Design an enzyme around this catalytic site. Structure first.
Site, PDB file in Angstrom:
ATOM      1  N   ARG F  41       9.242  -0.511 -11.479  1.00 16.41           N
ATOM      2  CA  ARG F  41       9.887  -0.143 -10.226  1.00 16.41           C
ATOM      3  C   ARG F  41      10.306  -1.371  -9.393  1.00 16.41           C
ATOM      4  O   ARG F  41      11.363  -1.359  -8.770  1.00 16.41           O
ATOM      5  CB  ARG F  41       9.024   0.830  -9.413  1.00 16.41           C
ATOM      6  CG  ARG F  41       9.695   1.259  -8.108  1.00 16.41           C
ATOM      7  CD  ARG F  41       8.923   2.346  -7.380  1.00 16.41           C
ATOM      8  NE  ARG F  41       9.047   3.641  -8.029  1.00 16.41           N
ATOM      9  CZ  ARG F  41      10.062   4.473  -7.837  1.00 16.41           C
ATOM     10  NH1 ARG F  41      11.052   4.141  -7.008  1.00 16.41           N
ATOM     11  NH2 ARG F  41      10.086   5.640  -8.465  1.00 16.41           N
ATOM     12  N   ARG F  73       1.892   3.561  -1.879  1.00 17.59           N
ATOM     13  CA  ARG F  73       3.134   3.870  -1.162  1.00 17.59           C
ATOM     14  C   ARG F  73       4.189   2.764  -1.299  1.00 17.59           C
ATOM     15  O   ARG F  73       4.081   1.704  -0.667  1.00 17.59           O
ATOM     16  CB  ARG F  73       2.822   4.094   0.326  1.00 17.59           C
ATOM     17  CG  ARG F  73       3.795   5.000   1.047  1.00 17.59           C
ATOM     18  CD  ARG F  73       3.451   5.097   2.520  1.00 17.59           C
ATOM     19  NE  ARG F  73       4.185   6.176   3.166  1.00 17.59           N
ATOM     20  CZ  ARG F  73       3.788   6.820   4.262  1.00 17.59           C
ATOM     21  NH1 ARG F  73       2.658   6.490   4.872  1.00 17.59           N
ATOM     22  NH2 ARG F  73       4.532   7.794   4.755  1.00 17.59           N
ATOM     23  N   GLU F 422       7.908   7.174   0.785  1.00 21.49           N
ATOM     24  CA  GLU F 422       7.856   5.745   0.475  1.00 21.49           C
ATOM     25  C   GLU F 422       9.025   4.883   1.010  1.00 21.49           C
ATOM     26  O   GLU F 422       8.783   3.772   1.468  1.00 21.49           O
ATOM     27  CB  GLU F 422       7.686   5.515  -1.035  1.00 21.49           C
ATOM     28  CG  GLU F 422       6.433   6.146  -1.651  1.00 21.49           C
ATOM     29  CD  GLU F 422       6.430   6.066  -3.171  1.00 21.49           C
ATOM     30  OE1 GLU F 422       7.223   6.801  -3.800  1.00 21.49           O
ATOM     31  OE2 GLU F 422       5.635   5.288  -3.743  1.00 21.49           O
TER      32      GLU F 422
END
Ligand SMILES: Cc1cc2nc3c(=O)[nH]c(=O)nc-3n(C[C@H](O)[C@H](O)[C@H](O)COP(=O)(O)OP(=O)(O)OC[C@H]3O[C@@H](n4cnc5c(N)ncnc54)[C@H](O)[C@@H]3O)c2cc1C
Ligand SMILES: NC(=O)C1=CN([C@@H]2O[C@H](COP(=O)(O)OP(=O)(O)OC[C@H]3O[C@@H](n4cnc5c(N)ncnc54)[C@H](O)[C@@H]3O)[C@@H](O)[C@H]2O)C=CC1
Ligand code: FES
Ligand code: FES
Ligand SMILES: [Ca+2]
Lengths: 98, 99, 49, 99, 464, 483, 98
Positions: F41, F73, F422
């Protein structure tokens, strides 16, 4: 300004969002600012979190035993002092895993 | 009926939104739920009735179980504490009727 | 036993979870050669509880 | 049901029932009930939050109001800390009838 | 005696076998089943366990109300007080205005911090029914929230001071006359003089001393007896540093240890006076006296702005901070820089010391003998041409451990800018509070100018 | 996960960036857990909002003798994006051009492909940007910052505006599924459950709102009591901001099943109430219980071919923040923050604004306050609030402004909403870079060159801020000299 | 369950319907929040009524697994289930009978 004692101005907040369409039903709550469903109970201390669940009469308590070393072999474990504590039931280790 | 296990309920109030969980020796979870909810004045979706097993029923726990369940559900609601009642055999034979 | 604590300890010991992950697009050698300026650096970002 | 362990704050209930087949309830006296250690409360029709009408065809009371209509008619329920204290307290609930 | 008697939400609690290791939090949750009060840290930092205490203050002939961390409050310290929890102020059938407003303004997400925040706001209102916006924010110095980002809590509570997400016009009004009565029993019980109490637990004996003679006699025969006032250090040492003190003495009831005396040279506080009392008396004095007289007072107050929050300052004693003698105490540098006068007593002895470098001979050590206790501290008026500053820098402004903390004083020869006395004291620069004693004497008789600035800086860079 | 990055950026005098090479390393601790997905990510977000034609990112996860690091988060995103914003800040400084112009000119346009080849459709970012520039009065406030700094030697102000793009969906495609079970009892009350867990984000509130719209009954008739494996099995974690998207669809499908079963009773009694239809269905022996299920379609990225869509859609937002630092202590005030967030057509603007503020304040902690300390032997020193400093009531921006973008429905998610959990966290980097701007103003006062690229690691603590404000005091303490 | 072996019979039915051993199937309890609006366990009808309900719930599951059974015709039950899950196919179903 170096000598000034710490001081802030008072807060000034703005929240902007979109109104739902004019012909949306008043019972249709999607897009409306409905407060969190549990907010009133949370404010009153009536909302139940895990530890707020009452204990059973026969309920026991567990505490983890953790390493004080970053990387090491465990050469021995002594539970003799543990066994002297009133209410001691057992010490679980890898051996105890079924 | 003389089911070996007499009528029994545990009502556990959850302290939120009228939610209550009943553990009952009953053949009829639906009416147990409905009768409790109507007595308390809450929707059916707040009341959960659970039955693992009964020590016999033979029809005697099809409706008459609810006379214990409701009283118990009421005590649990009022106190905010779990409440339990198992009937003695003499109580059960007197109250719950038969064929 | 010998401990590996920091990122640099792990790099020096080849202590990784699996292999290198990579995304690449275009032509870097040409990209860098035709730029007016090149800036390099390092950044550290602490974790969070 | 009764094999399920008790919560540490769990209470016990005991039903109090009619000793007359058809009578008016003219008074209930709980003076003695209140002397039993562990006594919490005595629930009657007054304590019902919503409806005292129950049963499959809605012709039954949760707790008797004004009259009893069988020997065994549930008039109320004692709540106490233990089943022994609940039974003792239920004996100290004195009811007066007019046949 | 040996029965412990207090009130929770207006109901009498009689505890016949009180263990000194039992905190109020554990007692509320596990003995009374009142789980509105939460455990979030157990170390005074989060406020999730905030409750209100009410008691009759025998000195003032008045009922007082203050918040505390239930996680650090020993129940043995609570004889004859009234505790109020989130359950005591309202419920979903009748919400207290504090409860309604935090809920409706979206100030409650996960909700775990909510009862503690509710109790801090509630406590403020019992003391000040119409607080300023600043008083409202100050109420929450010892409360943390991880979900909301704080904005909605302050915004909803702003309505108590002096398309939309919520409607403050639909909020029910506050009627302060409708709060719970102070238990009549406790008013009747204050007519009877307080006697020594002893509590015995599995490992710990607690003696609640009623007189100075009792305390000093106990310290004479058992110098190992550990004094506990607010328990904000001792509670931490017991829970986190695995310390066990088998004998505890609590001197909090003793009048002499709670007295405030205005003298010629300053104000003396009994060593058991809570930091919140110090703050309230110094604030009154700062408001009424000339600025010339209140330089040291305003130095203490600046430090106290950033000292924990309301819950800790309600029970934390001035003498507890001095005696703990942490190198990063925020008050010791200020007391050292002002040379505050300390009175030390044992059975058969009384002496006075002006706090200086010798008061702290080692790490967490003072010059107190094992049988002595700290009786009082005199915080001095400043003189004409005497100036004072106090400093603290931590990792966060609010409720944090100083990296460096400081008290600084200068006295000028009258009518001049020439230095008569200079004191620069620091916490966080050694294993004790220190004075910059190599640097400061060189500055005496110098004028306050750029040459002095440069001389002090070079001196500090070398000495520290 | 702590990250270490080594970057090299090539750019034109215009500020246009033409080449970017970044190597990332993360500290994973003593088990793998989610570490590799977190690194993925971060790599997915190394562009932040910027189109870079020649680009290479690598990631390596370190195996260490520390407690195992995990999901937080943002999930690698805020780490990947801060690196992007850090070299970008250095590009602007080097060019001598305003930061906001350099960022804007490097920003993607609608229809661009990312470095991982996903097309940016419904690209609302330029709108968030223009609205925030305008509502924050950014250019006017830049001038006032400049003026404050001329008038003040030992306090300095800084101001920065930062964009963000955040991909929505689990990076492991099969986790993008959700389930629900609904019952209608004979009094017409509805008991609903789904795979999502309530942790303060108002998920059950949103699901009740969704169910109420789907069934056309008041929310008061619908209750969620709990989440359980014996009512909905095989649930994905409540994570990836995904839960309202996934469970909302599942809830919706279970409700549609119920409506289809009730439709002949609705036809027989067009006006008769809900309670009549339900009792009629019951006494006609029609089932009043239904499962619902949903999976996100068309997902699956391959690292080998650099093709396939990892995300279902993207969240966009922009924050402008102003700070005032105390150059002598390292303390600072957060003066004002303006946030404009695209949450699609919000399911609940109260909950969504709460999530923007909550997420922002956690990022504020990440980038400026929160620091963990370990002994050389790897023992955590920081074990409670006394030593671990999360934002307090007094830490938040004094003027805190949040706007949800108007007129931006997102058809591909439940009732045109977007996930919100997030994406806003990283926007607190606007405070970090405002601080860096304030520090630069302080450094210039000590004669220390403009265009000088001084080091600011994250978090920008009072220690790091104070040490970076070089003056006669730091010089004396460090080297022993000054004047 | 009141001693009439109803849960035993339902497991027997489900095992045949799913074509898996009874050992892979478990019934723990009866609850209003798993199956609503239930008739009493009465009129000797419960195996008939619930058996049909169980059969239908099982048929729904089998229908969902069929593409995976067709691909891996001998591969075990556990393979089809893990394949269904990782293909994001629902492994939960209600069943009903009148
Ligand atoms: C959340 C939190 C925040 C804090 N913030 C700060 C801060 O900002 N700055 C700071 O300096 N400290 C801080 N502290 C430390 C602490 O609160 C103070 O030191 C406090 O004043 C201790 O007082 P107490 O009455 O609670 O002491 P106790 O814990 O009861 O006792 C402390 C010590 O003093 C001794 N003692 C008490 N009275 C006497 C007496 N009269 N004579 C002789 N010995 C005595 C005791 O035997 C014990 O050794 C903080 C603590 C917490 C839990
Ligand atoms: N809980 C809280 O939030 C707060 C607590 N307090 C105080 O903080 C204390 C923390 O206790 P401990 O962790 O035991 O810390 P401690 O009392 O041992 O103090 C540690 C500090 O002392 C200094 N120090 C110690 N030895 C030194 C040396 N040899 N050379 C130079 N400097 C040295 C350093 O500044 C170090 O950070 C508490 O007892 C309390 O009194 C203060 C503020 C907040
Ligand atoms: S639990 Fe955090 S302060 Fe008491
Ligand atoms: S709402 Fe969760 S911590 Fe405050
Ligand atoms: Ca890991």
């Amino acid at each position: 300004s170096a000598t000034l004692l710490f001081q802030k101005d008072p807060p000034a907040n703005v929240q902007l969002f979109q109104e739902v369409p004019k012909d949306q039903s008043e019972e249709d709550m999607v897009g409306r600012p409905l407060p969190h469903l549990a907010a009133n109970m949370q404010a009153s201390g009536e909302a139940v979190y895990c530890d707020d669940i009452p204990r059973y009469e026969n309920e026991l308590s567990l505490r983890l035993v953790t390493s004080t070393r970053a990387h090491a072999k465990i050469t021995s474990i002594d539970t003799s002092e543990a066994k002297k504590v009133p209410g001691f039931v057992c010490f679980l280790t890898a051996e105890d895993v079924p | 009926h003389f089911y070996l296990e007499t009528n029994c309920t545990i009502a556990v109030p959850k302290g939120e939104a009228g939610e209550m969980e009943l553990f009952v020796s009953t053949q009829n979870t639906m009416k147990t739920q409905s009768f409790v909810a109507k007595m308390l004045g809450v929707p059916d979706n707040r009341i959960v009735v659970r039955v693992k097993r009964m020590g016999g029923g033979f029809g005697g726990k099809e409706t008459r179980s609810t006379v214990v369940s409701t009283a118990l559900a009421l005590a649990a609601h009022k106190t905010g504490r779990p409440v339990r009642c198992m009937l003695d055999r003499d109580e059960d034979m007197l109250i719950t009727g038969g064929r | 036993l010998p401990a590996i604590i920091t990122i640099q300890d792990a790099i020096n010991n080849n202590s990784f979870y699996g292999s290198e992950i990579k995304i690449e697009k275009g032509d870097l050698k040409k990209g860098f050669s035709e730029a007016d300026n090149v800036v390099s650096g390092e950044l550290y970002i602490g974790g969070q509880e | 049901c009764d094999d399920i362990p008790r919560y540490e704050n769990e209470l016990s209930l005991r039903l109090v029932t009619s000793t007359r087949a058809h009578a008016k309830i003219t008074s209930i006296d709980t003076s003695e009930a209140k002397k039993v250690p562990g006594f919490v409360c005595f629930l009657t029709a007054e304590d019902v939050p919503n409806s005292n009408a129950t049963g499959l065809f809605n012709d039954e009371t949760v707790f008797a109001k004004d009259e009893v209509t069988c020997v065994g008619h549930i008039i109320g329920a004692v709540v106490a800390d233990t089943p022994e204290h609940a039974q003792r307290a239920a004996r100290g609930v004195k009811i007066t009838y007019e046949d | 005696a040996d029965e412990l008697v207090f009130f929770v939400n207006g109901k009498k609690v009689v505890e016949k076998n009180a263990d000194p290791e039992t905190t109020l939090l554990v007692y509320l949750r596990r003995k009374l089943g009142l789980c509105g009060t939460k455990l979030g840290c157990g170390e005074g930092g989060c406020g999730a366990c905030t409750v209100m205490i009410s008691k009759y203050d025998r000195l003032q002939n008045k009922i007082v109300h203050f918040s505390v961390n239930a996680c650090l409050a020993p129940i043995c310290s609570l004889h004859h007080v009234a505790v109020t929890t989130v359950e005591g102020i309202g419920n979903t059938q009748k919400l207290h205005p504090v409860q309604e407003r935090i809920a409706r303004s979206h100030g409650s997400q996960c909700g775990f911090c909510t009862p503690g925040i509710v109790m801090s706001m509630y406590t403020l209102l019992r003391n000040q029914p119409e607080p300023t916006v600043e008083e409202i924010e100050n109420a929450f110095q010892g409360n943390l929230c991880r979900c909301t980002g704080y904005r909605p809590i302050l915004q909803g509570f702003r309505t108590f001071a002096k398309p939309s997400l919520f409607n403050p016009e639909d909020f029910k009004p506050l009627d302060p006359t409708q709060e719970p009565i102070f238990p009549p029993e406790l008013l009747r019980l204050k007519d009877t003089p307080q006697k020594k109490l002893r509590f015995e637990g599995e490992r710990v004996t607690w003696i609640q001393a009623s007189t100075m003679e009792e305390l000093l006699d106990l310290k004479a025969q058992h110098p190992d007896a550990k004094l506990v006032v607010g328990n904000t250090e001792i509670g931490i040492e017991m829970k986190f540093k695995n310390m066990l003190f088998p004998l505890i003495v609590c001197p909090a009831w003793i009048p002499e240890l709670n007295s405030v005396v205005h003298g010629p040279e300053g104000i003396s506080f009994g060593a058991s006076c809570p930091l919140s009392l110090v703050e309230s008396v110094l604030a009154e004095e700062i408001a009424k006296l000339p600025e010339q007289k209140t330089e040291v007072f305003r130095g203490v107050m600046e430090q106290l702005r950033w000292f924990a929050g309301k819950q800790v300052k309600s029970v934390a004693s001035i003498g507890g901070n001095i005696i703990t003698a942490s190198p990063i105490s925020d008050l010791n540098p200020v007391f050292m820089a002002s040379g505050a006068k300390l009175t030390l007593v044992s059975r058969g002895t009384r002496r006075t010391v002006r706090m200086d470098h010798t008061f702290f001979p080692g790490y967490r050590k003072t010059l107190l003998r094992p049988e002595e206790i700290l009786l009082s501290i005199e915080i001095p008026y400043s003189k004409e041409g005497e100036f004072f500053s106090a400093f603290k820098q931590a990792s966060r402004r609010e409720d944090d451990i100083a990296k460096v903390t400081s008290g600084m004083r200068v006295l000028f020869k009258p009518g001049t800018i020439e230095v008569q006395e200079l004191s620069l004291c620091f916490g966080g620069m050694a294993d004790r509070t220190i004075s910059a004693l190599k640097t400061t004497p060189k500055q005496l008789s110098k004028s306050w100018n750029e040459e002095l600035l440069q001389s002090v800086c070079a001196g500090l860079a070398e000495e520290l | 996960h702590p990250f270490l990055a080594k970057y090299k950026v090539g750019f034109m005098k215009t500020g246009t960036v033409v080449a970017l090479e970044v190597a990332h390393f993360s500290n994973g601790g003593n088990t793998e857990d989610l570490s590799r997905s977190i690194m993925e990510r971060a790599l997915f977000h190394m562009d932040n909002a910027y189109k870079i034609p020649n680009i290479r990112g690598t990631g390596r996860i370190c195996k260490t003798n520390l407690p195992s690091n995990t999901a937080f988060r943002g999930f690698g995103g805020p780490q990947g994006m801060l690196i992007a914003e850090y070299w970008m800040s250095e590009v602007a400084i080097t060019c001598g051009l305003p930061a906001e112009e350099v960022r804007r000119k490097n920003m993607y346009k609608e229809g661009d492909l990312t470095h991982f080849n996903q097309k940016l459709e419904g690209f609302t970012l330029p709108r968030c940007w223009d609205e925030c520039i305008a509502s924050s009065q950014y250019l006017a406030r830049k001038r006032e910052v400049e003026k404050f700094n001329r008038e003040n030697r030992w306090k300095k102000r800084g101001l920065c505006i930062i964009p963000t793009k955040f991909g929505i969906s689990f990076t492991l495609p099969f986790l993008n599924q959700g389930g629900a079970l609904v019952h209608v009892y004979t009094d017409g009350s509805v008991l609903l459950t789904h795979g999502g867990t309530e942790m303060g984000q108002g998920l059950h509130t949103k699901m009740v709102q969704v169910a109420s719209r789907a069934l056309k009954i008041p929310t008061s008739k619908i209750h969620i009591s709990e989440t359980s494996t014996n009512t909905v099995p095989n649930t994905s974690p409540t994570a990836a901001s995904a839960s309202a998207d996934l469970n909302g669809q599942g809830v919706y499908e279970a409700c549609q099943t119920i409506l289809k079963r009730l439709e002949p009773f609705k036809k027989k009694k067009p006006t008769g109430p809900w309670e009549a239809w339900v009792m009629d269905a019951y006494t006609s022996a029609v089932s009043l219980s239904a499962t619902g299920f949903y999976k996100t379609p068309n997902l699956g990225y391959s690292f080998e071919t650099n093709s396939g869509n990892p995300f279902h859609y993207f969240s966009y937002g922009v924050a402008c923040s102003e700070v005032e630092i105390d150059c002598l202590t390292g303390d600072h005030k957060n003066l004002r923050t303006d946030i404009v967030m695209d949450v699609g057509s919000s399911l609940n603007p109260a909950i969504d604004i709460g999530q923007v503020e909550g997420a922002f304040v956690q990022g504020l902690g990440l980038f400026t306050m929160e620091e963990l300390h370990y002994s050389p032997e790897g023992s955590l020193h920081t074990r409670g609030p006394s030593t671990y400093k999360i934002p307090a009531f007094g830490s938040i921006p004094i003027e805190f402004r949040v706007s949800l973008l108007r007129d931006c429905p997102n058809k591909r998610a439940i009732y045109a909403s977007k996930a919100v959990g997030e994406p806003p966290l990283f926007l607190a980097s606007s405070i970090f870079f405002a601080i860096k701007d304030a520090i630069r103003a302080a450094r210039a006062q000590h004669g220390d060159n403009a265009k000088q690229l001084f080091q600011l690691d994250s978090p920008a603590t009072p220690e790091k801020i104070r040490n970076a404000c070089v003056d006669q005091f730091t010089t004396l303490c460090v080297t022993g000299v000054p004047e």
